[PDB]
RNA sequence: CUGUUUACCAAAAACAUCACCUCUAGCAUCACCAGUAUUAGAGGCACCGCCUGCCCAGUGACACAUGUUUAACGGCCGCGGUACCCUAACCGUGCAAAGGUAGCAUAAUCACUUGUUCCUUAAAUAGGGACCUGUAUGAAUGGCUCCACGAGGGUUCAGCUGUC
RNA sequence: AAACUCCAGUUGACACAAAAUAGACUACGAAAGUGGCUUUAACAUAUCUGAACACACAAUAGCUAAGACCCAAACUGGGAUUAGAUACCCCACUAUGCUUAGCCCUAAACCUCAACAGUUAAAUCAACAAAACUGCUCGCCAGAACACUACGAGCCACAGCUUAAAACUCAAAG
Ligand SMILES: C[NH+](C)c1cc(NC(=O)CNC(C)(C)C)c(O)c2c1C[C@H]1C[C@H]3[C@H]([NH+](C)C)C(O)=C(C(N)=O)C(=O)[C@@]3(O)C(O)=C1C2=O
Ligand SMILES: [K+]
Ligand SMILES: [K+]
Ligand SMILES: [K+]
Ligand SMILES: [K+]
Ligand SMILES: [Mg+2]
Ligand SMILES: [Mg+2]
Ligand SMILES: [Mg+2]
Ligand SMILES: [Mg+2]
Ligand SMILES: [Mg+2]
Ligand SMILES: [Mg+2]
Ligand SMILES: [Mg+2]
Ligand SMILES: [Mg+2]
Ligand SMILES: [Mg+2]
Ligand SMILES: [Mg+2]
Ligand SMILES: [Mg+2]
Ligand SMILES: [Mg+2]
Ligand SMILES: [Mg+2]
């Protein structure tokens with residue numbers, strides 16, 4: 049079999065790795081905003097729970113841990 | 119639960135040999151577990167468990183005897199791994215033996231509950247019922263539920279404080 | 286179980302070899318060994334130059350110790366011989382007479398393998 | 408080496424026939440594999456390459472020994488044709 | 494697939510037919526914005 | 533980050549600092565230390581996260597046998613031409629120890645300049661986000677992010693009020 | 697050429713590196729993998745199949761420390777070649793290859809051929825390849841390319857991996 053179909057993936061992958069290298073700092077800034085919005089979205093969900101369960105405040109002694117951090 | 123087999127006991131092959139009581143003291147220790155491999159000790163341990171539990175001591179192809187024989191291996195693998203923490207091949211042999219025993223124990227339980235109870239007692243095996251859903255407990259989950267349990271406990275302590283309002 | 290100690294000594298004189306052999310046999314006994322026999326294979330020239338304990342050896346007395354010991358005694362005896370400066374080389378092996386040789390039936394010549402390729406006209 | 412010298416790979420020269428001695432030495436080294444091993448040991452032959460070469464040589468020996476066996480088997484029939492003309 | 498697999502999966506469903514430029518409409522009414530030629 | 537400072541015009545972005553790294557030292561009866569290289573001294577830098585590129589020619593240290601050494605002092609290119617213009621993947625030539633890498637960039641930073649654009653006001657030489665790109669940004673003289681923190685500097689919603 | 701010239705050549709002493717021959721053998725292991733010697737421990741299941749909501753593994757290369765240093769070596773620097781040579785050739789040297797303790801979880805991880813039970817009878821049988829098939833089960837596939845991609849999610853992974861699309865385009869791709 050020829051390798052004409054491997055060579056397409058070969059170039060795709062090569063270009064992608066070079067693209068990530070060129071933009072790894074732009075991509076990092078975008079990824080930090082995403083994990084930040086992700087933690088907010090998580091807290092809303094937990095908040096929504098106890099508000100729907102009638103409770104007016106968070107359970108006594110509860111803190112929402114920052115699960116989306118390094 | 120920690121009963122260690124005596125080390126002087128004779129090999130399973132020379133136990134019945136008649137007249138062995140008249141041999142020299144040296145010959146007794148040449149035919150003992152002191153001068154034998156670790157596998158020779160496992161034959162005696164299996165023999166003791168089999169005579170204790172199995173109704174017919176000579177039946178080796180019975181579901182009971184197999185569980186006994188498999189439990190002695192599980193014991194032998196666990197001790198091996200206590201010294202060799204990175205022996206991944208023997209780590210795999212342990213986890214497969216354990217699943218094969220649960221498989222034997224599930225069958226015995228469903229066929230002969232009488233002897234199933236005898237096995238679980240003699241070998242100190244606690245049969246557990248397999249969990250239904252094998253789900254991964256990642257952080258988001260492990261926190262959601264941890265909160266949802268605390269919320270429920272709080273709502274519990276508001277009916278208590280609302281029946282005291284009927285008063 | 287049964288072992289054999291292939292013991293190369295330092296080509297000494299009788300008092301020293303007897304002294305050295307006695308040490309080794311006691312150290313086996315001290316670790317729970319039942320010594321079965323002692324054999325003298327004779328002082329030969331070494332197949333090659335063995336450097337042991339800051340000495341260059343060319344000759345040595347070959348001995349064999351047939352003994353029974355618990356499996357844990359092997360590591361301890363191995364380490365003991367490391368520190369004896371009259372041993373050129375010592376190795377403990379399972380006794381060769383413990384293993385029973387299975388009866389062999391004979392060389393069976395291998396027929397040419399067949400049906401490796403389809404019988405089509407290429 | 409810790410071994411004795413002038414024992415291994417050593418050939419005695421007869422009647423000053425150096426050419427014949429060196430020739431027999433070469434044969435010994437070749438017949439034992441030493442020559443070919445030294446040549447392959449000049450550059451590192453990677454494990455993938457070593458396996459590709461050993462497979463090739465072993466497929467070659469089989470074919471070569473089977474062709475040699477067929478040539479030797481049919482050598483008897485190279486004699487003169489007995490029915491020349493029909 | 495086996496019969497057990499063919500049961501577990503069910504019918505072959507269907508790709509939701511993608512709409513066309515006319516958005517599934519016989520015709521459409523537009524306002525000319527510019528006129529040009531393309532080769 | 534808590535801390536520290538110009539008692540009496542500066543409390544700070546300055547210093548220290550956890551951390552990281554460079555240098556020196558094989559040893560006792562007064563510091564270090566009644567210690568002993570996982571130690572102890574001399575310094576840099578500044579938690580952490582991502583990193584910390586290239587240069588040993590010069591000057592210093594060390595080796596003083598050809599040398600080694602930048603988390604030592606320091607440094608880190610030109611002149612012409614080529615896709616309308618812009619720019620040059622590219623081309624020619626020269627020069628250096630190496631030719632400023634990764635980042636970051638309308639600002640504690642600012643020729644033009646109050647750039648341009650998007651937000652923000654009715655109105656912005658303010659502030660925020662970007663883009664342009666650097667007379668003279670740039671990697672422990674640390675570079676770039678980020679939690680928390682600050683009588684620090686700046687912008688702001690709402691309210692509040694004799695600030696008006 | 698540059699390089700070395702505290703260098704070469706006999707001889708002696710000397711590994712924490714790697715394991716001629718045997719091996720024309722074809723064994724062990726779930727796969728990855730395993731070929732110097734010794735010893736200890738040790739190679740699951742007395743039906744079969746079966747976890748992409750789970751567990752335990754997984755070459756090489758990488759990452760985090762802490763050591764080792766014979767050689768080999770990305771990078772880098774010189775020598776050479778060339779129109780250029782950021783290569784192929786030469787020399788030198790590093791990460792790395794080793795040990796220990798944790799990660800990372802990927803391969804043309806392919807013998808691209810699933811497990812179990814069977815059949816060479818028929819009509820073998822597109823081509824080629826490693827002959828055509830039956831029962832049973834699981835796992836996978838449904839033009840090309842966008843795409844080992846984006847979003848989302850998980851993950852000790854922050855230039856990562858695993859899952860994984862769509863729009864525009866084409867009349868082919870194979
Ligand atoms: C008068 N020139 C020499 C000058 C002066 C200043 N600033 C000052 O002199 C400031 N003086 C104070 C400190 C206030 C007393 C300057 O600040 C500058 C410049 C030069 C320009 C050159 C610009 C030029 N282009 C974009 C118009 C250009 O091609 C370059 C270049 N490198 O080739 C530039 O970088 C340029 O944009 C630039 O940055 C300049 C200045 O910054
Ligand atoms: K203050
Ligand atoms: K501004
Ligand atoms: K602006
Ligand atoms: K302050
Ligand atoms: Mg003052
Ligand atoms: Mg004061
Ligand atoms: Mg004053
Ligand atoms: Mg003051
Ligand atoms: Mg400071
Ligand atoms: Mg830091
Ligand atoms: Mg630097
Ligand atoms: Mg730059
Ligand atoms: Mg701005
Ligand atoms: Mg200026
Ligand atoms: Mg300027
Ligand atoms: Mg500067
Ligand atoms: Mg400096």
Ligand SMILES: [Mg+2]
Pocket residue numbers: 533680
């Ligand atoms: Mg803090």
Ligand SMILES: [Mg+2]
Pocket residue numbers: none
């Ligand atoms: Mg303070």
Ligand SMILES: [Mg+2]
Pocket residue numbers: none
């Ligand atoms: Mg402030």
Ligand SMILES: [Mg+2]
Pocket residue numbers: 691
């Ligand atoms: Mg107001």
